[PDB]
Amino acid sequence: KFPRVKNWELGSITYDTLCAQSQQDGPCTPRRCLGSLVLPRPAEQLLSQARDFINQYYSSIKRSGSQAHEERLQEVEAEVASTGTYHLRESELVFGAKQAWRNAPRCVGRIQWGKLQVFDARDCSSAQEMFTYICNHIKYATNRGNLRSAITVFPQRAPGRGDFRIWNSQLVRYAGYRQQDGSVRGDPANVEITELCIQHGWTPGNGRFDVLPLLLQAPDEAPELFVLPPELVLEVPLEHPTLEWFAALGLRWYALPAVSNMLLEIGGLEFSAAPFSGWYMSTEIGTRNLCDPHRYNILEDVAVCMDLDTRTTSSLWKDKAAVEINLAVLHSFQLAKVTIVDHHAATVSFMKHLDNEQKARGGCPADWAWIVPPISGSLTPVFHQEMVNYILSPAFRYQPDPW
Amino acid sequence: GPKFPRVKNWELGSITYDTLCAQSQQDGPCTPRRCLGSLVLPPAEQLLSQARDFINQYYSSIKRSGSQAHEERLQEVEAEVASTGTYHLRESELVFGAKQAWRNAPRCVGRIQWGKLQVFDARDCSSAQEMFTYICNHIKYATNRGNLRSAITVFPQRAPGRGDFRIWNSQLVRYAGYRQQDGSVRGDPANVEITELCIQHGWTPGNGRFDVLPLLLQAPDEAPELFVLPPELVLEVPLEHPTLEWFAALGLRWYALPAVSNMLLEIGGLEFSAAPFSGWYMSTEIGTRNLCDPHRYNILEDVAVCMDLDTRTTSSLWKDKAAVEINLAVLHSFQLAKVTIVDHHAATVSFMKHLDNEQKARGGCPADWAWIVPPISGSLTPVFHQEMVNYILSPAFRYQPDPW
Numbered sequence A: 001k002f003p004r005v006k007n008w009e010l011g012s013i014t015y016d017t018l019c020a021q022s023q024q025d026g027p028c029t030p031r032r033c034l035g036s037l038v039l040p041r042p043a044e045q046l047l048s049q050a051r052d053f054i055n056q057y058y059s060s061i062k063r064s065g066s067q068a069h070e071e072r073l074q075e076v077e078a079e080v081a082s083t084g085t086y087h088l089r090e091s092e093l094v095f096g097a098k099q100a101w102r103n104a105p106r107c108v109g110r111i112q113w114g115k116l117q118v119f120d121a122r123d124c125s126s127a128q129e130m131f132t133y134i135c136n137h138i139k140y141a142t143n144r145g146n147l148r149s150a151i152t153v154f155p156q157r158a159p160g161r162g163d164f165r166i167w168n169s170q171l172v173r174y175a176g177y178r179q180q181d182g183s184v185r186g187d188p189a190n191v192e193i194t195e196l197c198i199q200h201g202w203t204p205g206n207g208r209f210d211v212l213p214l215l216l217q218a219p220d221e222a223p224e225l226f227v228l229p230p231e232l233v234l235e236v237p238l239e240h241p242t243l244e245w246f247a248a249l250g251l252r253w254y255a256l257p258a259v260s261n262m263l264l265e266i267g268g269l270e271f272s273a274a275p276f277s278g279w280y281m282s283t284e285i286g287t288r289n290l291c292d293p294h295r296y297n298i299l300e301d302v303a304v305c306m307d308l309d310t311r312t313t314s315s316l317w318k319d320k321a322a323v324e325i326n327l328a329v330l331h332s333f334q335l336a337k338v339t340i341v342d343h344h345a346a347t348v349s350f351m352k353h354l355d356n357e358q359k360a361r362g363g364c365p366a367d368w369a370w371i372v373p374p375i376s377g378s379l380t381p382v383f384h385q386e387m388v389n390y391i392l393s394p395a396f397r398y399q400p401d402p403w
Numbered sequence B: 001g002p003k004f005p006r007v008k009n010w011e012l013g014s015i016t017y018d019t020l021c022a023q024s025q026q027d028g029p030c031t032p033r034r035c036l037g038s039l040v041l042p043p044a045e046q047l048l049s050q051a052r053d054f055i056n057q058y059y060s061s062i063k064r065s066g067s068q069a070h071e072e073r074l075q076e077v078e079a080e081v082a083s084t085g086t087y088h089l090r091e092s093e094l095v096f097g098a099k100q101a102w103r104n105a106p107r108c109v110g111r112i113q114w115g116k117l118q119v120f121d122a123r124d125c126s127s128a129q130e131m132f133t134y135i136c137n138h139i140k141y142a143t144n145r146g147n148l149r150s151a152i153t154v155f156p157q158r159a160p161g162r163g164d165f166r167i168w169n170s171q172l173v174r175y176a177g178y179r180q181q182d183g184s185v186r187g188d189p190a191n192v193e194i195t196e197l198c199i200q201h202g203w204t205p206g207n208g209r210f211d212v213l214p215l216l217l218q219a220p221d222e223a224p225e226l227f228v229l230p231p232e233l234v235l236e237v238p239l240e241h242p243t244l245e246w247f248a249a250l251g252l253r254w255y256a257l258p259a260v261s262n263m264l265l266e267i268g269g270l271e272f273s274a275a276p277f278s279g280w281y282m283s284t285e286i287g288t289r290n291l292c293d294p295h296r297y298n299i300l301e302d303v304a305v306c307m308d309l310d311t312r313t314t315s316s317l318w319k320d321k322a323a324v325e326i327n328l329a330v331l332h333s334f335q336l337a338k339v340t341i342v343d344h345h346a347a348t349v350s351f352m353k354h355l356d357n358e359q360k361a362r363g364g365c366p367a368d369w370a371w372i373v374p375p376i377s378g379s380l381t382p383v384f385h386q387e388m389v390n391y392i393l394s395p396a397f398r399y400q401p402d403p404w
């Protein structure tokens, strides 16, 4: 059986046949669906994943079954047979990284998947050198506000040794300072990493938007501390198009969303340090980062400034304040000439991506709970679109924290 | 550690384990290879086991498992089955089963109320005219002049050989949907087919945006008959806004009573093909889905124009702004009219309380995240941050094929 997928707004129906190429089990079983869960609970194997990936690569360049194709499988086989592992050509790696983004079910930004600048950093042997590559990435990706998607790929994992790792979950994070009286100053999501930085010698600040340093780790060594040159970290001060007092709140966010703690798996090789960046969708900053109860939690403050009735839920003060905060983010980013996409625009393009992918591959892995935005869900077309979630390789995956 | 699904709340950081799912006797649409959780719609020896299971559920609920009465009722049920092929529920078993079906419904956010359900037994009903009297009674009792009371009316069970009782309409209250020559729809496009069915069966149609449909009621092996609800039994709330004076001029309205009439109620293998149930609305159902879905009333652009918003670009957030005010109008207008309603914040907070109750009482709660999280302001509600486990328990409300 192939899943019958329906759009309830338009009445149209597709069949996902791509899921048959899934070689990895998810968390669901016939007895119960575990879809809303955020986190998960041999030479022949490697060789098999290598052959299958090499076959995808040569299929992608219309040279499948050719001579260069067969010699490449020969190479891979020979290298694994002798050393237990192998290595990718740079052009293969580039193909692999784009394909991993393309396959990421939780990503609403995949219309962009073919446009990705890939920096090969596999020739890196120290934390200092990682830092050099990281600064290059940030400088390129940021491009004075004209953001460009990029990934930098550090050396693959090896059986013999510890991993290359970036300890920070993103290249840019605001410190979270735990007070003696339980509360948090700054970003509460970053309390643990803030404390790790301090322990490793960083002189902390006392602000709510203190850009953290990076903890970079070369294999089997203590991580090293590197401060990002403040001119490389582009930030956008937040104001509101019609609410003059909003700017007073001193709110701000950084331009570059660059995830640095996921593992990139291509053809069985694993890249434990491979930071990637694109550009923000406004709800990430406006709704989640600023309004989550366990993040900056600014909803009530903004509601009070707007003079809303905050004593009852039925006045929708939360809904009203959230919309103004999101609007302030879009306004501010557009004012600063920094790329951002609103959730209506983002989801319309994802619908186009679904149709592209339906034609190119016969389906598209999508995580509904993650694709539908955190405000105004049914106001976007993805809400009305059934989706099929499953795991394809190449893939980005979670990995354990290196401490 | 524990060999059951681990469930995390990401706002609070707390963990539970769902052991209730072990009790699931029916498989959903998911497999290890792919998740189909976002899809809306993916006997003799059999009957006995389902029956035995339900009777065990019943005797546990009254804390008498293993007792003399428990084993006698088991013998009583398998006796009746062996000699007829089916069996009858005691009254109190029906009341238990109906409640348990609601308690078990994964897509329902209102389940904190589950123990408070008035069950009207109508298993004696023997005509379509009689079904109508029962339905009127339900509506009268449940509406209660605006102070809504949850209720279900249970009509006769499927009987081997004999045809089903069916209410053709999807709800007891439904606005007509009149397809136009230009291909558009006047009224509710959700109800185009049932509207045409009513006409085909001799209803004289109106031409408004809010014409209350007649009921098509079908007794065993008979053609359905048409029944017009007396307008004084159908409570409606005109929609106005607390500060935007022009909103009332839009002439929008909604009915007080959400009463679902097309689901099958399954208890212990017995099937009640007509068993309409009603509660009260969550405001987002009306304010967001029914009024702003593009394939429903689709008034978002109308309202945004009245609010003088820039509808030419997505990034003005005109949709979001307009949706918020429409939802506000629904709440304000129901409150003014003294008609029970619950906003999505109060509703989701109470659902979180329900999850905690069920965690202690049953070791879990089957829940469908995509349906539990509201259609506006998702992450502003606590359920967005709550992982959920979805599975099918019985007694249950189930979808059944349309009778035509």
Ligand code: HEM
Residues within 6 Å of the ligand: A097, A101, A104, A106, A107, A108, A109, A110, A112, A116, A149, A150, A151, A276, A277, A278, A279, A280, A281, A284, A341, A346, A370, A396
């Ligand atoms: C170009 C603009 C992009 C936009 C607007 C975008 C948007 C998003 C959003 C909103 C999420 C949900 C994140 C959250 O709520 O925490 C997400 C997830 C994700 N993104 Fe994209 N993204 C973009 C580019 C990229 C790129 C360039 C990559 C990698 C090459 C990527 C890989 C991923 C992955 C793997 C996830 C899922 C993470 C997980 O499973 O936890 N994205 N994206």
Ligand code: HEM
Residues within 6 Å of the ligand: B098, B102, B105, B107, B108, B109, B110, B111, B113, B117, B150, B151, B152, B277, B278, B279, B280, B281, B282, B285, B342, B347, B371, B397
């Ligand atoms: C008392 C207040 C109640 C509230 C606020 C409430 C709320 C809701 C909401 C918002 C939905 C989502 C439906 C949709 O989006 O179309 C729903 C679904 C559902 N409700 Fe409740 N409900 C209530 C009472 C009841 C009662 C009394 C019953 C039965 C005795 C019931 C059974 C169900 C079932 C079976 C579903 C899911 C049906 C499906 O799968 O489509 N509800 N409810």
Ligand SMILES: CNCCN(C)c1cccc(CCc2cc(C)cc(N)n2)c1
Residues within 6 Å of the ligand: A109, A169, A257, A258, A259, A261, A262, A276, A277, A278, A279, A280, A281, A284
């Ligand atoms: C732990 N779960 C989520 C945190 N991680 C690892 C994660 C992964 C992917 C995306 C995000 C949100 C940040 C982000 C990244 C990119 C590339 C684009 C974008 N708009 N946002 C965060």
Ligand SMILES: CNCCN(C)c1cccc(CCc2cc(C)cc(N)n2)c1
Residues within 6 Å of the ligand: B076, B077, B079, B080, B083, B088, B089, B090, B091
């Ligand atoms: C509300 N009506 C059902 C009450 N119950 C459970 C009930 C009523 C009368 C008799 C019985 C005994 C079971 C039984 C056996 C046989 C041969 C026929 C029958 N109708 N019921 C059970």
Ligand SMILES: CNCCN(C)c1cccc(CCc2cc(C)cc(N)n2)c1
Residues within 6 Å of the ligand: B040, B110, B170, B171, B258, B259, B260, B261, B262, B277, B278, B279, B280, B281, B282, B285
């Ligand atoms: C696709 N699923 C729709 C099935 N139907 C008709 C259905 C079932 C249950 C609930 C609803 C929404 C209407 C409703 C009913 C009740 C009892 C309470 C409430 N707040 N809303 C609709």
Ligand SMILES: C[C@H](O)[C@H](O)[C@H]1CNc2nc(N)[nH]c(=O)c2N1
Residues within 6 Å of the ligand: A035, A036, A037, A038, A369, A370, A371, B010, B384, B385, B386, B387, B388
């Ligand atoms: C429990 C639930 O799955 C969790 O809160 C998810 C819901 N959907 C999400 N969607 C996005 N884009 N990002 C998130 O962090 C989450 N969180």
Ligand SMILES: C[C@H](O)[C@H](O)[C@H]1CNc2nc(N)[nH]c(=O)c2N1
Residues within 6 Å of the ligand: A008, A383, A384, A385, A386, A387, B038, B039, B040, B370, B371, B372
């Ligand atoms: C495709 C998707 O599952 C579908 O649009 C669902 C999403 N969640 C929902 N949630 C509720 N409460 N009601 C609905 O009708 C839907 N529709």
Ligand SMILES: [Zn+2]
Residues within 6 Å of the ligand: A028, A032, A033, A034, A035, B030, B034, B035, B036, B037
């Ligand atoms: Zn699933």
